[PDB]
A paper describes a structure:
Although we were unable to obtain crystals of C. albicans Aro1, we used cryogenic electron microscopy single particle reconstruction (cryoEM SPR) to investigate the Aro1 structure. Nevertheless, we were able to identify a subgroup of particles corresponding to dimers of full-length Aro1. After 3D classification, we identified 87,484 particles belonging to a stable conformation representing a dimer of full-length Aro1 at resolution of 4.19 Å. In this map, we performed only a rigid body fit of two high-resolution models for Aro1DHQS-EPSPS and Aro1SK-DHQase-DHSD domains. As implied by the crystal structure of isolated Aro1DHQS, dimerization of the full-length cryoEM SPR structure of Aro1 is mediated by extensive contacts between the Aro1DHQS domain, resulting in an arrangement similar to the one observed in C. thermophilum AroM homodimer. Notably, we did not add any ligands to C. albicans Aro1 sample used for our cryo-EM analysis, nor did we observe any evidence of endogenous ligands in the five active sites, in contrast to the crystal structure of C. thermophilum Aro1 that contained numerous ligands. Interestingly, within the Aro1 dimer we observed asymmetry between the monomers, with the Aro1SK-DHQase-DHSD region tilting ∼55° relative to the Aro1DHQS and Aro1EPSPS domains. The Aro1SK-DHQase-DHSD region of subunit 1 is tilted away from the Aro1DHQS-EPSPS region and is referred to as the “loose” monomer, whereas the Aro1SK-DHQase-DHSD region of subunit 2 is nearly parallel to the Aro1DHQS-EPSPS region and is referred to as the “tight” monomer. The Aro1DHQS domain, Aro1EPSPS subdomain II, and Aro1SK-DHQase-DHSD backbones show nearly identical conformation within the core structure of each region with minor differences seen in some loop regions. This implies that the large movement of the Aro1SK-DHQase-DHSD region does not drive structural changes that modulate substrate binding or catalysis, but instead reorients and repositions the domains. However, each individual active site is more than 40 Å from each other and each face outwards from the core of the dimer.
In the human fungal pathogen Candida albicans, ARO1 encodes an essential multi-enzyme that catalyses consecutive steps in the shikimate pathway for biosynthesis of chorismate, a precursor to folate and the aromatic amino acids. In Fungi and Apicomplexa, the second to the sixth steps of the shikimate pathway are supported by five enzymatic domains combined in a single protein known as Aro1 or AroM. Aro1 forms a flexible dimer allowing relative autonomy of enzymatic function of the individual domains. Our activity and in cellulo data suggest that only four of Aro1’s enzymatic domains are functional and essential for viability of C. albicans, whereas the 3-dehydroquinate dehydratase (DHQase) domain is inactive because of active site substitutions.
Author numbering:
A (entry chain A): 988 to 1550
B (entry chain B): 1129 to 1269
The structure:
Amino acid sequence: QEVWLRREKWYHECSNYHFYSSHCSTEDEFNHLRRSFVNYIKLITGAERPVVPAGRSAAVVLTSPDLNEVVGDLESITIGADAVELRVDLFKDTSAEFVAAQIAVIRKHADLPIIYTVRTVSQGGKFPDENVDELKSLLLLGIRLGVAYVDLQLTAPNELIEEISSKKGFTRVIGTYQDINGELKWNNVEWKNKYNQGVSMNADIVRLVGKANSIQDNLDLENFKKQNTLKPLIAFNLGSQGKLSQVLNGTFTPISHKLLPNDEEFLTIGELNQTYFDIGGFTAKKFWVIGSPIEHSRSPNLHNAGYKALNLPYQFGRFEATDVDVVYDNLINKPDFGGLAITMPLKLDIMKFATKLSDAAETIGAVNTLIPIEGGYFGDNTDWVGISNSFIRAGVPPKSSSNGLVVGAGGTSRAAIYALHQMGCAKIYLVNRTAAKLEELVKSFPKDYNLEIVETEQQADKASKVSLAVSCIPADKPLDGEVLKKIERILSNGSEQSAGFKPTLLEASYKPRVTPIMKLTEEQYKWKVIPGVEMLVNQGDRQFKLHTGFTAPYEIIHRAVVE
Amino acid sequence: GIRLGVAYVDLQLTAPNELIEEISSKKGFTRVIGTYQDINGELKWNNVEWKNKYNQGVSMNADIVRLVGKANSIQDNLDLENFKKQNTLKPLIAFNLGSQGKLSQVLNGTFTPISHKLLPNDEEFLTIGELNQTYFDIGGF
């Protein structure tokens, strides 16, 4: 404590972006810090900014004085919300040390974009208007803590607007005007002048929050929204008569929770979807999981945990099928068809129905998601994004420099080859039980996806940088023979290569929780091993994003498979 | 039904002229609602098909015109709120059938059709407990 504090005034001025590391207790807390660091470093380096979500997003309005109070339920607070609206004014301390501590306790539990709102008194906040200097200095802590969306008011000083529009970096700007009185209707030219203040300052999104004295004022909002289309518009009324304007809003509807001080009567995530269904935005759809041995699939338990948390009106069930024509005349052609999640004996046959296959569906040769689109159906393979996101959730970087190893030629063998190439492995090394189904994988994959086949034991010594292995042998045979000798000299060159992570193996079989290959890579040569309960979730997480358009609540769907 | 003293006879706007003129020349006092439903469900609420069927109702001296759509999205319910603004000569009933046209049934003043649990129901009209709950959940009550 002696050596740190004397350099705090020389570290925090000589840096144009800050970041905060803390002591993490659980592995979920470690994971959220290294996930919110990637989107931070995708923002402050400037590669891919989060571009203003094109679906129907929402934003949780954290109205707490200190977020260590509601700290365990914060993963339950941020459910269905695609951004976090920190209101910086209503912190108990508006100091630079406190706001950076409250941003520290949210990237540990929520890997979400932060909307840095310093709302002033004339627009409904607890920050004063007469101290302009600590407002300009607060929005500059949003640029330098790497938040995603900064809040610049439009009835603000014009030196503050042109300072957090020339020094914004890659933190996007939302421009707000609020009618606290309610004397403007949505035909007055003051709303047109505020949209043109958003177009002229080159703000990314514009916010126009009115106040509804009748239900007609919600339909005057939607006639303003279709006459003003250049910059995206978060426009919604307030009061207890403007609930249609928050329900019908597309980008960044403010939501709240039971555990938060909801004062501007914002809806919860259940009440927003329940009202969107009763006015006809959603339909009661039916999703299915199809395959021959479907008696213990554990996929309907995952999705039904997410529809319940978000209050969407969908159901997930099973349909035993062996042919693809019974899927089309019992599930697909019905008007309540929502999508499919296709399992093992039917992955190859459902590719004939996708009029738009993704690039992963062509390269792998199996489709496990069939959602309807305009004029046909869309086919995606989310098994590569389950083999991948199981690695990224256990500390492997998304674009690291290591090498891989696919042990087996099973049903998931081709996705694991594809997931290893778009991981960043410079070379994939196939090592199989028997060499019969071996060379077919190289003739059916591009030479860019180099699959150097290991054939002898001396070749294991030339196999370099293997720290992202995947095992997809069936877990019926304890490992022996020619195959065991190939792997044991492969995993031995493990942690000493040090590519920024600990060497990782991912077992792909769900039901054998401790596979013999999971013992040998962990109890002998010290790797991090991941069970196949993690792949069944992360395959289902991207199917949940594809089926519903909504990010799935992870602890609610993880604690639906693990029982 | 005119002879039995019903209060709202219901001609259709696509009826033959010798039946719209026969009913509307001896209605006496029974008001005429003039209907045209889009049963296929492709005409959005900005065609000249909906201006004509409205204008057929004003031309036949109908006291209410009914114009019933079918919603394929939530925009056809907000397309209907702009059609009722432009046409307030005669009283208008205008809603969008289907599961995606529930908002146009909640936001409709004159004679919103409802149904009950002890009746057969095919066009998915809400009850009085759901029409007043959704009108509360969007902030009219």
